[PDB]
Amino acid sequence: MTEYKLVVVGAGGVGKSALTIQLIQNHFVDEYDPTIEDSYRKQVVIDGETCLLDILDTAGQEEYSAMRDQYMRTGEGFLCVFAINNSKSFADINLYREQIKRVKDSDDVPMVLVGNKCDLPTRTVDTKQAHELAKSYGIPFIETSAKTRQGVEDAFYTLVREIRQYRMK
Amino acid sequence: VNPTVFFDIAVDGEPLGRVSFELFADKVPKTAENFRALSTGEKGFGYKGSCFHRIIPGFMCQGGDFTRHNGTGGKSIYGEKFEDENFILKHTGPGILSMANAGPNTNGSQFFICTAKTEWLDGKHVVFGKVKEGMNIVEAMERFGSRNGKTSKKITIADCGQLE
Ligand SMILES: CCn1c(-c2cc(N3CCN(C)CC3)cnc2[C@H](C)OC)c2c3cc(ccc31)-c1csc(n1)C[C@H](NC(=O)[C@H]1C[C@@H]1C)C(=O)N1CCC[C@H](N1)C(=O)OCC(C)(C)C2
Ligand SMILES: Nc1nc2c(ncn2[C@@H]2O[C@H](COP(=O)(O)OP(=O)(O)NP(=O)(O)O)[C@@H](O)[C@H]2O)c(=O)[nH]1
Ligand SMILES: [Mg+2]
């Protein structure tokens, strides 16, 4: 069984852990439990083949931005998450992408842009703006809700497909 | 005169020992008083029976969530949260007692005890006390922590109160 190393990154409070826990445990709770660093495992059938996902849920806490290099070296693909009601979190995305590009010394890193909390009516980030950013990076963009599960499997499975393609190069 | 409180710490229900703290009521009276009252339980709720849910060897032991017991809860005697009183005192080394928070003006009941100097927390967490006796008990609690803070045994406040 092929084992994919996924890493979930993005600013504090955008829903990185809620997305991961929805995928792994099929569960959502509204409580705030800010992350130090957590790791999960899940096997899934993607495009008719069983995959094993190793998922690293990272801290958004802004004070430790210089502590990310080790996990960026280790990870194969990255879920870059912002929240659609937090414009600062969308601006932070480019900062994360530049950091991953530097550490891996590459422009071709498997990556998916995720706009989370789409269940909420108070949108401040235009969907077209995010699509355009993802197009400029050459990566997929998926809108998700960890609360309703919209797009959750699509985001993680899409990232697996991006890595699958990368591995065949 | 600054008040003194104690925790009797247990590991999986077995006594480990007593840690005592001086609370700096002269510099942070509102924050000191919250911790003092939660230690006696005199408002009908408080630290007794709660656990240290996050212990990271080399840095700190964190606890104080007596409402959800999962590291997400806690409340002050003033309401769920209260404001940062001041940042006069610094995280100068092992033994410092300081409030956990989720950003500016979000103090509740969660707190941490430093096991090293944590200077980058200065100006972001309110320091309000320090270990007086039993720092080696706090050092002993680090034996049950881990890199991400998950504990390997249940570390509890079996009893707490104020010393005369
Ligand atoms: C990069 C990895 N990382 C690290 C980190 C940092 C270093 N450095 C090495 C070089 N030096 C100079 C700088 C630091 C080394 N190794 C690691 C760890 C061991 O690598 C896994 C930390 C950390 C903190 C958070 C997220 C990721 C984090 C975080 C996420 S929420 C938070 N902090 C603040 C936390 N709020 C809460 O709980 C809210 C829910 C309640 C109400 C809070 O009030 N307190 C009290 C103070 C301590 C803090 N918890 C905490 O646990 O700090 C852990 C610590 C290890 C001290 C710092
Ligand atoms: N309405 C709504 N709330 C969400 C969604 N995802 C997360 N939340 C809420 O947003 C808050 C933060 O979620 P969390 O997953 O902890 O964010 P995080 O990115 O892991 N934060 P950190 O970087 O500190 O670990 C919680 O209150 C959570 O319930 C979502 O899709 N919709
Ligand atoms: Mg998280």
User: Is the CB of A36 less than 8 angstroms away from the CB of B54?
Assistant: yes
Domain ranges, residue A14: 2-168
Backbone interruptions in chain A following residues (C to N > 2.5 Å): none
| Amino acid symbol at B29 | P
Experimental method: X-ray
CATH number (1.10.10.10, 3.40.50.150, 2.40.100.10, 3.40.50.300) of B4-163 reads 2.40.100.10
CATH number at residue A58: 3.40.50.300
**Contacts A63 to B, Cβ<8 Å:** 120, 124
The verdict on the CB of residue A116 being under 6 Å from ligand 2 is yes
User: Is the CB of B72 less than 8 angstroms away from the CB of A32?
Assistant: yes
In chain B, domain spans:
4-163
- Give the sign of the dihedral formed by CA B88, CA B91, CA B94, CA B99: positive
Domain total in chain A = 1
User: Is the CB of A32 less than 8 angstroms away from the CB of B149?
Assistant: no
Q: Give the 3-state DSSP-derived string for B5-63, with helices as H, strands as E and coil as C.
A: EEEEEEECCEEEEEEEEEECCCCCHHHHHHHHHHHHCCCCCCCCCCECCEEECCCEEEE
- Of all ligands present, the nearest one to the C-alpha of A60 is 2
C-beta of residue A9 within 8 angstroms of C-beta of residue A78: yes
**Contacts B70 to A, Cβ<8 Å:** 31, 33
Resolution for the entry shown, Å: 1.6
Q: Which among B81, B84, B53, B60 is positioned nearest to B156, based on CA atoms? A: B53
Residue nearest to atom 29 of ligand 2 (CA): A30
